């Protein structure tokens, strides 16, 4: 679903530009719903990597 | 039923059917977690005072009935800020200040069976009836020696009226800004300013007095933008407020973040300035042509701040899009810029 992907997208951008990792918990929960809707979607791996990459910068 | 005047009910309720409710309440471990409190048949509850409900922060439903309650302190519900249902029926209340419920989000205010005396101090309750608030219309409340509340004459009853004088034009960082608040009305009790946490975005100097309150915000910073500046005044009838904002112009600024790949790629950015800056991307120093696949998209703006955030979105970029992304941000003060290298796909 395109609406879910845009919601994860916006949560990740918000976490980057505000430095607030609280936005990343929402991206994760939305990502698990995205994965259930379409297990063959190749974008889910990109969202997962993006979320991890943002958490790394914010934690260190 | 229990051998105390107050007995717990449900998960977070207390029901008190005999005299001594307040004493019993304040000896109950965990009373601060009560969400409902029912009280009846008190014999020494002529007054409800600020301290009587101290600590009952979680209280949502409060009922005090059949207890000869005559006087409710204007701050009697200061310690119950979450109260949403308040039933004071079948007491001896002849009046009730608008201050008692100010700031409560009451879905229900029950005043049946009280010898209400109509006066300008009851105009606020008439307004609730007029506006369909608090379940008040269904009560058909009466002025005890007169007719219904819905017909209480009220030509002489009015909250204060306010006029706030503000600069028409924007100001610059470092300016001094003069505001003034003119107050009219009968029986004025108090007036002043509420300045939501300025965070030292201005030096605050008040001057003069009624009927024209003076406010100078001196040496303003850009953070004075979006701050609510409120003039308020109060009489026996009610409270009036007016909130204004001052616009502080200030130069553009821009910052970029490392590109991140999602279903599109994003080069995230933040931009600030007022007037809001115009934005222009360059790629290796040439103006970037925004297309269906490479375009600027903003996050929704926030009411409490002037900064804006967004992305340069890239849908399926190739190695030809590897290079130097510069974001230019310009307003009347000049042009700011930030640059970042971005790589999207290996060279073939
Ligand atoms: C505001 O509080 C008053 C309390 O004075 C509420 O009035 C009371 O409402 C209860 C519940 O309906 C009545 O209890 C009933 O008593 C009869 C007795 O036969 C019983 O058979 C019923 O099963 C029920 O328990 C009570 O009589 C009544 N008291 C008075 C003086 O009217 C009122 O409902 C509250 N208002 C709101 C909007 O919640
Ligand atoms: C009761 O409220 C206190 C705070 O006043 C809180 O620390 C405590 O966890 C609450 N108890 C329960 C069971 O919710
Ligand atoms: C308050 O009373 C209403 C109406 O009876 C009820 O639905 C609600 O559950 C009560 N609230 C609490 C926190 O008990
Ligand atoms: C109460 O005041 C309002 C505002 O002027 C007015 O429209 C209304 O008619 C008044 N109510 C009565 C019963 O006089
Ligand atoms: C105005 O504020 C700035 C920043 O705090 C300060 O450096 C400057 O000296 C202030 N000007 C006056 C006149 O106080
Ligand atoms: C990137 O482009 C901007 C705008 O043309 C320029 O000012 C900056 O020097 C460039 N960076 C490099 C490393 O060439
Ligand atoms: C605006 O509100 C958000 C959310 O409460 C907060 O994170 C942010 O820091 C606020 N910004 C300013 C400039 O007050």
Numbering used by the authors:
A (entry chain C): 1 to 60
B (entry chain A): 35 to 382
From the study:
The design of proteins that bind to a specific site on the surface of a target protein using no information other than the three-dimensional structure of the target remains a challenge. Here we describe a general solution to this problem that starts with a broad exploration of the vast space of possible binding modes to a selected region of a protein surface, and then intensifies the search in the vicinity of the most promising binding modes. We demonstrate the broad applicability of this approach through the de novo design of binding proteins to 12 diverse protein targets with different shapes and surface properties. Biophysical characterization shows that the binders, which are all smaller than 65 amino acids, are hyperstable and, following experimental optimization, bind their targets with nanomolar to picomolar affinities.
We succeeded in solving crystal structures of five of the binder–target complexes, and all five closely match the corresponding computational design models.
